[PDB]
Design a binder for this molecule. Structure first.
Ligand SMILES: Nc1ncnc2c1ncn2[C@@H]1O[C@H](CSCC[C@H](N)C(=O)O)[C@@H](O)[C@H]1O
Ligand SMILES: Nc1ncnc2c1ncn2[C@@H]1O[C@H](CSCC[C@H](N)C(=O)O)[C@@H](O)[C@H]1O
Ligand SMILES: Nc1c(O)cccc1C(=O)C[C@H](N)C(=O)O
Ligand SMILES: Nc1c(O)cccc1C(=O)C[C@H](N)C(=O)O
Lengths: 341, 341
């Protein structure tokens, strides 16, 4: 049936309805004051009535809102976000899609065909990875880590629940960005110390996250290039969070070997990110989020299969290699291994 | 559950997967040569292996392709397009989404706030409707109508099947574009005459449509402004195809009154386009296609409701006013009426 083409042929428009729903304050409004009529929505949102009608038609047909005798409410996929304390997280992730992902996504066909991250051209600069370009635009690094922070809040419950974190003591957070996961881990397991290793630009943001959490004594930053610099010794566990998806298999094996060398004997390596199913059928989230990785971060970036990741861990010399499957609707999991005593 | 958000939060990426499948020739390849392995796909499409895997993961998770034992075929929605002779139509429509709609869709929020078609900025020029800007880029106007021609082919079965065309003799096709519907009508009704009224630039494209159909005698072009020029007299039937969606309700009443005066007593008026359901719940297609209309053609464009259109015909003096429902997966119909004899 051809009808299945509708959410795909108009997929960009479907995203724009959610985008508009968020930016214009519709979902917050319906949460607090629903049911509301179309006129009431137009008055509260200070929109022309035609505009309100267009938005409401879009969100209602998508199931993001419901209408009942002319009265509008949040649909359950939106209500769920508010229920689970995730509305600011979803809001910030949609802003990321809008400000970072959407326009470079137009360069997807070219990026596939040329094997480049072509969409990076929408960001001023000359280097070939997104992260080293963030400093070129005032406020851009902060905007980026706001989104990345929210992405991690969404995805890291599987990380925080990892059994290793009730055994390990000292965690090296490689490319740990703004310390979102370091702080979450520190709060979840109070005996952990964590070192957040990243570029100076990112650690500038990480310091604010750590200070706000009041965790200066348990979470520290460390400026280093993940490829060209030595990792700090004395760590019990090496964490790659939302990191190996950026690089080639060849590059990841290099990083996992550095991890092996740096982790103490008996220690753990943990790879936390989205994963592609080994049968290459999905999940849908990963298959679609690949458009971002194909177009922006780096010319090799992609959401790798579980099995390929486990393969790299063994080749790096880790033993007892395995995986923890997603507990929910996102495709995030953990691949883990041990350095032999 | 938040899981329902995946095709919307990543909706732009879903479109890009369809977009890439089309442009890179995947769906034609799988149609002719399926099943193929990922390697055979990469070789045939001249993609790096990583790129082929990313693409194939995307199309398969979406159901645009299927995989069995590593062998890839077109999935149901794509197969159905080839089956029904619609593959060239879908290809050209996806190219229109890519080249015309996608980037202006990002101006949706601004368009909603200001009640302007703010996405028109992606096109060189200064005038306030998309169509008068088309001539400013070499090949753009012909590119537009290639897309529009395909939209019309996809949607006009309900038009062609209209009983009226067995009872009328001379159709004035108001804003008839590249004559796609005039020609389809004339082929289906061998004694029907049609006048395609549009801008000079559109009629230059319509000339080729008409020529390649050999319908010079029965299908003619008439350069005129639909608002400011007189409609030529002597026509039995006034047709608005994909036209009233561009304009405000007030402008449409103006147009329908002109249609009334110009049509012979006893004559018919037909309005053919996408329609929004009277209860404002959808259809999804219309609710999403509205992002295009909001961002690009004109500051008032929108997919109007059946009942509002019917209302206009009656106020313009037409009687025996009624509608013809969509006989399938798209939201296209005909609202029609008569001038009293
Ligand atoms: N060459 C390099 N040296 C150090 N850090 C790098 C790097 N290339 C990329 N990174 C870091 O890799 C991170 C990718 S985003 C993931 C950040 C964090 N782990 C989280 O889950 O939220 C960015 O913070 C980026 O600065
Ligand atoms: N002021 C105007 N005068 C004449 N034609 C106009 C116009 N404003 C818009 N149009 C025409 O309205 C048409 C909208 S696109 C629809 C074209 C055709 N009826 C089809 O169904 O395929 C374009 O061809 C555009 O040139
Ligand atoms: N934006 C990212 C990045 O630059 C690197 C790694 C991950 C990300 C992410 O946004 C998270 C990703 N969408 C996920 O949900 O797995
Ligand atoms: N592109 C259009 C236009 O400029 C004017 C009127 C209609 C159109 C369309 O593209 C057709 C619309 N997508 C439909 O399927 O009904």
């Amino acid at each position: 049936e051809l009808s299945a083409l509708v959410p795909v042929l108009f997929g960009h428009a479907a995203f724009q309805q959610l985008n508009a729903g968020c930016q214009l304050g519709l979902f917050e409004l319906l949460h607090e004051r629903g049911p509301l009529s179309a006129e009431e929505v137009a008055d509260a949102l200070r929109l022309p009535r035609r505009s309100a009608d267009i938005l409401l038609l879009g969100t209602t047909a998508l199931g993001l809102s419901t209408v009942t005798d002319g009265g509008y409410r949040n649909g359950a996929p939106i209500g769920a976000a508010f229920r689970d304390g995730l509305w600011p997280v979803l809001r910030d992730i949609v802003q990321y899609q809008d400000k970072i992902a959407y326009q470079p996504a137009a360069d997807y066909v070219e990026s596939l065909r040329t094997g480049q991250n072509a969409g990076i051209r929408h960001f001023p600069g000359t280097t070939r990875d997104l992260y080293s370009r963030l400093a070129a635009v005032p406020g851009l690094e902060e905007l980026f880590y706001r989104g990345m922070h929210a992405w991690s809040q969404l995805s890291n419950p599987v990380l925080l629940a990892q059994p290793d974190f009730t055994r390990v003591h000292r965690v090296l957070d490689v490319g740990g960005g703004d310390a979102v996961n370091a702080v979450a881990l520190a709060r979840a397991h109070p005996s952990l110390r964590v070192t957040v290793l990243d570029r100076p630009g990112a650690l500038e943001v990480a310091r604010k996250t750590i200070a706000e959490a009041g965790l200066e004594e348990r979470v520290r930053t460390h400026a280093a290039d993940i490829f060209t610099d030595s990792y700090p010794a004395g760590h019990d566990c090496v964490l790659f969070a939302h990191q190996l998806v950026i690089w080639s298999p060849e590059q990841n094996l290099t990083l996992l070997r550095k991890a092996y060398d740096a982790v103490e004997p008996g220690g753990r390596v943990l790879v936390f990110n989205a994963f592609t199913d080994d049968d290459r059928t999905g999940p849908l989230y990963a298959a679609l989020d690949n458009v971002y990785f194909t177009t922006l971060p780096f010319r090799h970036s992609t959401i790798h299969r579980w099995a390929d990741c486990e393969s790299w861990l063994r080749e790096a010399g880790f033993t007892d290699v395995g995986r923890t499957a997603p507990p929910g609707w996102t495709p995030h999991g953990v691949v883990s291994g041990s350095r032999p005593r």
